[PDB]
């Protein structure tokens, strides 16, 4: 189904076209990612996180890296942290473009889809320049980032950010004050603050319902405590308010990107500890200790001290969490992935009470579900 994102079976009971109940049948994209992660090492399990929410890829990588570094008791260097924050905001822009345009396409509008996907193409070029892969970069790793930026990336990112607010403005010219869009979205999928908190919603759902909560502000990670930005807050808790929150979050991510570009520091890109991050190729090819550590890291992997951690980040779709359990070996004993869309899709049935088929389509769009992360 075009509106079902490919791998959702929504068993719906309809009285006429009014929706009597929704019974989301998921697992059509369940792969066994957690079992496979148990069978891989810590470096081999990074692309699995790359492919979970395949619209916020560097965000998933950052969450996994933060969890592993917390268990390892190491600290990424400042330049690595600033690169992580910059690309996390670029990833947030990518994800919010995808969310808004696909929501508007399920409504019926396609020109914004095409425009903002041209912008997505430019950001994909940035991804490919740093990493060599257009989406599944596998660039953010425990201990920092894999490689340093090429010598024109910051200038090109500055140009892109310079010419992007106009694209957001053109997007808003077609949707914000359009009475058809307002009729389709206003007072659709209203969720109260208490209901959102109990059902376990996070991120844009809470902010649209009016709860003042954001992990980047309350529980900062990396260098998010050194950047200034505003947290959009909704009032009516409906699709229109969540759309406004997402657009304003795109603008605030532009703010953060500008600050990162101006404040990028010099230095190294990974923790200067060859027992966790690999040494450089020249050191590997000239130094015996470096060659030994390269061999051991790429065959067995670093050992992680035993323990369990739950680390969460403010991914573009809400709170993305990882509960990682290590038994002192080079391979993770347990890895539970908390995708924010799981709870939202669980709450889909309540939000669609007393609505119609088109309303349910709009509600799915405003929840912004990725079934890769839902099913894992």
């Amino acid at each position: 189904h075009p509106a079902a994102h490919g791998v959702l079976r929504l068993v719906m009971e309809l009285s006429g076209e009014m929706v009597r109940k929704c019974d989301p049948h998921i697992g059509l994209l369940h792969r066994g990612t957690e079992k496979l992660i148990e069978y891989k090492t810590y470096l081999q399990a990074l692309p699995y996180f790359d492919r979970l929410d395949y619209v916020s890829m560097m965000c998933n990588e950052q969450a996994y890296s933060l969890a592993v570094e917390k268990l390892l008791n190491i600290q990424p260097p400042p330049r690595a942290q600033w690169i992580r924050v910059l690309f996390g905001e670029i990833t947030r822009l990518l994800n919010h473009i995808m969310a808004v345009t696909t929501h508007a396409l399920d409504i019926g509008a396609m020109t914004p889809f095409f425009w903002m996907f041209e912008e997505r193409e430019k950001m994909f070029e940035f991804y490919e320049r740093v990493s060599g892969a257009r989406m599944h970069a596998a660039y953010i790793r425990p201990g920092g980032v894999h490689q340093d930026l090429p010598l024109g990336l910051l200038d090109d990112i500055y140009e892109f950010s310079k010419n992007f607010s106009f694209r957001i403005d053109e997007l808003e010219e077609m949707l914000t004050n359009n009475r058809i869009w307002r009729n389709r979205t206003v007072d659709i999928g209203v969720v109260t603050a208490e209901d959102a908190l109990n059902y376990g919603f996070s991120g844009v759902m809470l902010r649209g319902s009016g709860i003042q909560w954001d992990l980047r502000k309350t529980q900062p990670y990396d260098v998010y405590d050194q950047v200034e930005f505003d947290v959009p807050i909704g009032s009516r808790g409906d699709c229109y308010d969540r759309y406004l929150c997402r657009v304003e979050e795109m603008r605030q991510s532009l703010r953060i990107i500008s600050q990162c570009l101006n404040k990028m520091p010099p230095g190294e890109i990974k923790v200067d500890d060859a027992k966790v991050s690999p040494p450089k190729r020249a050191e590997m090819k000239t130094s015996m200790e470096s060659l030994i550590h390269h061999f051991k890291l790429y065959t067995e992997g670093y050992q992680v001290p035993p323990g369990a951690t739950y680390t969460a980040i403010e991914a573009p779709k809400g709170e993305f969490g990882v509960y990682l359990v290590s038994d002192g070996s080079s391979r993770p004993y347990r890895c539970k992935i908390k995708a924010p869309g799981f709870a939202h899709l669980a709450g889909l049935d309540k939000m669609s009470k007393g609505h119609m088929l088109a309303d349910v389509v709009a509600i799915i769009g405003t929840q912004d579900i990725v079934f890769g992360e839902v099913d894992r």
Binding site: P47, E125, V130, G132, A133, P232, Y240, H294, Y298, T299
Partner: protein, 176 residues
């Protein structure tokens, strides 16, 4: 800090009420959207003329694999199996034995390109730059079996793309 996305109230003066009534009766914002789409109609399209034009790529791009050689012609791979150990998807199968001249060289080197996830760990783990991910990405086949590369196929890819592979590695080897 935080901001309210939608908490403004409209003024109730007669001029503003008349303006809103005119917007309701005369579809002002609808005409505005029409004007935006007309502007995009008169702008320049952003389409490249594939296959006669190609999108930009970088020296870091990960495409089809290749096995390199030394400038003397000797194969770089020494059957160390680091790439096989580090491969996330277990796409590499390597079997080796001493050669006739006593070198440590591979007899079997298979990559299942239907199992590979094109992550580039193998070229990071290689201590002699033998296995690389070349710039080629247009290698789609008509049968599944043709995607099960072996040592002869990978060596042919390396010999065919050696110049471009060497140029890319020269460009990007100072960042590694």
């Amino acid at each position: 800090t935080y901001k309210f996305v939608n908490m403004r109230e409209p003024s109730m003066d007669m001029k503003s009420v008349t303006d809103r009534a005119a917007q309701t009766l005369l579809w002002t914002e609808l005409v505005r959207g029409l004007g935006m789409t007309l502007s995009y109609l008169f702008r320049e399209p952003a389409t490249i003329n594939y296959p006669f034009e190609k999108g930009p790529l970088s020296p870091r791009f990960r495409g089809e694999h290749a096995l390199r050689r030394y400038p003397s012609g000797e194969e770089r791979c020494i059957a160390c199996k680091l790439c096989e150990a580090v491969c996330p998807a277990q796409a590499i199968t390597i079997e080796a034995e001493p050669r006739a001249d006593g070198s440590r060289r591979t007899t079997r080197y298979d990559i299942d390109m239907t199992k590979c996830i094109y992550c580039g760990f193998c070229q990071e783990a290689c201590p002699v730059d033998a296995i690389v991910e070349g710039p080629n990405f247009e290698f789609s086949t008509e049968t599944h079996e043709e995607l099960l590369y072996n040592k002869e196929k990978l060596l042919n890819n390396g010999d065919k793309w050696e110049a471009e592979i060497a140029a890319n590695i020269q460009a990007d080897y100072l960042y590694r």
